[PDB]
């Protein structure tokens, strides 16, 4: 059963959560290929592991920059959680280590790129296509939430498309293991639940609100709340109003009214029946949850495969040096990394 599967998953997770893997590789074991992405977190570089010939996505954070951005605890959460989790729709953390200047998380590389690029280019996904992806996120949140983990940054930019056309969630920079409520203002403007904007204590229900934003954006081609500036986005989110494209099915609009629900006693994923209110919704009637988990469903889209190290699905970024100071920076802050 679902209860039994999650109980074994928790036993596996807790063993790693309580005794985290540390210092499992070194920078000199990898050949630098190209920058795949950048942000305030630092950068993600395509690398080749010489001993295996495998390609990986190496997330590199500058310790001093993490400290200035007040992201120490968040970065420790990201690495501690990633090394402990195991689910088909989560990107794997293969190695981690640090040096005098930087923190490194060597992740599974998905040459298929981010769902974001495909969604923007194609424009929108049909409902069966959006449902296929939505089902993987529902199962992933059922898994994460069962481990007391809140994800907090769901968006197409963080959903990688694998060689089989399935999803892999990446970027655990705001994930946190919390049993009670939490208060940090974090996430992406378009995806913030009203309780975050309003500075309330919040829980895992923010991930279910974010799922509503994602399904809408996938099926419409644009988010339910957009504007030129974040403040204007926040005004739309808290207004209690949402408009649907005329091509949205009645079942899709009903599911979205229940996910994009300001009232926490009414938001799907947050009620007595939990995730089953979503899994059992009419929009998901054709979804075979077990076949999705087992990856037996034919994917609606397979990204063009041009090799294990090809980067055609990624934008180009200015290449910067990976500098390693001769002096250890922020040793105490990142001691457990």
């Amino acid at each position: 059963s679902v209860k039994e599967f999650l109980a074994k998953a928790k036993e596996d997770f807790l063993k790693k959560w309580e005794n985290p893997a540390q210092n499992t590789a070194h920078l000199d074991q990898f050949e630098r290929i190209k920058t795949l992405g950048t942000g305030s977190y630092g950068r993600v570089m395509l690398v080749k592991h010489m001993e295996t010939g495998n390609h990986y996505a190496m997330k590199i954070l500058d310790k001093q920059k993490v400290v200035k951005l007040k992201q120490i605890e968040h970065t420790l959460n990201e690495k501690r959680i990633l090394q402990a989790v195991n689910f088909p729709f989560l990107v794997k953390l293969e190695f981690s280590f640090k040096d005098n200047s930087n923190l490194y998380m060597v992740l599974e590389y998905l040459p298929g790129g981010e769902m974001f690029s495909h969604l923007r280019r194609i424009g929108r996904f049909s409902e069966p296509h959006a449902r296929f992806y939505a089902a993987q996120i529902v199962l992933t949140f059922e898994y994460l939430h069962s481990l007391d983990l809140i994800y907090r940054d769901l968006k197409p930019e963080n959903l990688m498309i694998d060689q089989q056309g399935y999803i892999k969630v990446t970027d655990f920079g705001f994930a946190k293991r919390v049993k009670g409520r939490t208060w940090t203002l974090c996430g992406t403007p378009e995806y913030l639940a009203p309780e975050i904007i309003l500075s309330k204590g919040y829980n895992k229900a923010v991930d279910w609100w974010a799922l509503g934003v994602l399904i809408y954006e996938m099926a419409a081609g644009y988010p339910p709340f957009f504007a030129d500036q974040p403040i204007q986005i926040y005004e739309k989110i808290v207004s209690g109003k949402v408009r649907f494209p005329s091509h949205f099915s009645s079942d899709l609009k009903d599911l979205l009214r229940n996910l994009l629900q300001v009232d926490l006693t009414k938001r799907f994923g947050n009620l007595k029946n939990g995730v089953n209110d979503i899994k059992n919704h009419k929009w998901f009637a054709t979804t075979d949850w077990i076949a999705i988990y087992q990856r037996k469903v034919e994917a609606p889209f397979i990204p063009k495969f041009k090799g294990p190290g090809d980067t055609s699905n990624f934008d180009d970024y200015e290449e910067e040096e990976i500098r390693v100071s001769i002096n250890e920076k922020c040793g105490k802050e990142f001691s457990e990394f």
């Binding site: 942000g39 981010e114 920079g173 992406t188 081609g221 644009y222 504007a227």
Partner: peptide, 19 residues
């Protein structure tokens, strides 16, 4: 159209997390 309004907006590229 809503699509034209989105495409003309400044938020069609990758979106950054808040600070």
């Amino acid at each position: 159209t809503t699509y034209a309004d989105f495409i003309a907006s400044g938020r069609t590229g990758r979106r950054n997390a808040i600070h």
